[PDB]
Write a protein that binds this ligand. Structure first.
Ligand SMILES: NNc1nncc2ccccc12
Ligand SMILES: [Fe+2]
Length: 232
């Protein structure tokens, strides 16, 4: 057989996908990465499925760094029971993720964009609970709530591109869950490529209003060591 570990493979293919007979192009490369990810079971990373009140000093979610180049990041997000990763964007990024244990809800949205043929400004009479300050009203943007399914390790991988399902919210459902995440290019808060947060305003794909909000006071994510086979 003589092959590298499945995680070494994924990392190879993510590098090929995001940087003599003709080699793959972007679509075939993205479909193969998707293929490699679907096979990924929790035990291939030596991730024991977790289960089971948390002290205000304990992170609601944790992160295991597997690998990072300028083309992609590769890691695992792990949500303790009841937590959730708030609604955030991925500015100009592709992304793939694969739930390893437990279950999650993902809600996939997008801000309307006149490049896709849709027409984006808020009616001034529009009213929401809670009401909106002046600086807030100037910052709301139209979006679309595309999906809200909940996924388990049986489901396929979840994909995102610069222009679709680029905003999402992950809720740990019925206990703790964890997922492998690929992001390309990786975030860079120093290169003006940050992870921005949003809430949906409250006055079946529907036009919704989104507001950008700071990172929630009680949401943070901490490193924790990675038990699986090492990359390269
Ligand atoms: N990244 N933020 C944070 N970092 N460390 C501890 C924290 C404890 C409570 C709320 C936020 C926290
Ligand atoms: Fe994300």
């Amino acid at each position: 057989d003589n092959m590298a570990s499945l995680i070494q493979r994924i990392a190879r293919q993510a590098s090929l996908t995001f940087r003599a007979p003709m080699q793959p192009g972007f679509p075939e490369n993205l479909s193969k990465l998707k293929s490699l990810l679907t096979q990924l079971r929790a035990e291939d990373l030596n991730i024991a499925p977790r289960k089971a009140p948390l002290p205000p000093n304990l992170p609601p979610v944790t992160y295991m760094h597997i690998y990072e180049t300028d083309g992609f990041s590769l890691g695992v997000f792990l949500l303790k029971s009841g937590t959730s990763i708030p609604l955030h964007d991925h500015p100009g990024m592709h992304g793939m993720l694969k739930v390893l244990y437990g279950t999650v809800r993902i809600s996939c949205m997008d801000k309307l964009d006149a490049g896709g043929g849709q027409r984006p400004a808020l009616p001034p009479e529009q009213q929401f609970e809670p009401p909106l300050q002046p600086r807030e009203r100037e910052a709301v943007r139209p979006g679309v709530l595309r999906s809200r399914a909940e996924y388990t390790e049986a489901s396929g991988p979840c994909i995102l591109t610069p222009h679709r399902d680029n905003l999402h919210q992950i809720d740990a459902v019925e206990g703790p869950a964890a997922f492998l995440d690929i992001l390309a290019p990786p975030y860079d808060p120093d290169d003006g490529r940050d992870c921005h947060y949003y809430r949906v305003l409250e006055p079946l794909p529907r036009e919704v209003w989104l507001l950008e909000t700071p990172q929630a006071d009680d949401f943070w994510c901490e490193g924790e060591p990675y038990p699986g086979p090492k990359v390269f």
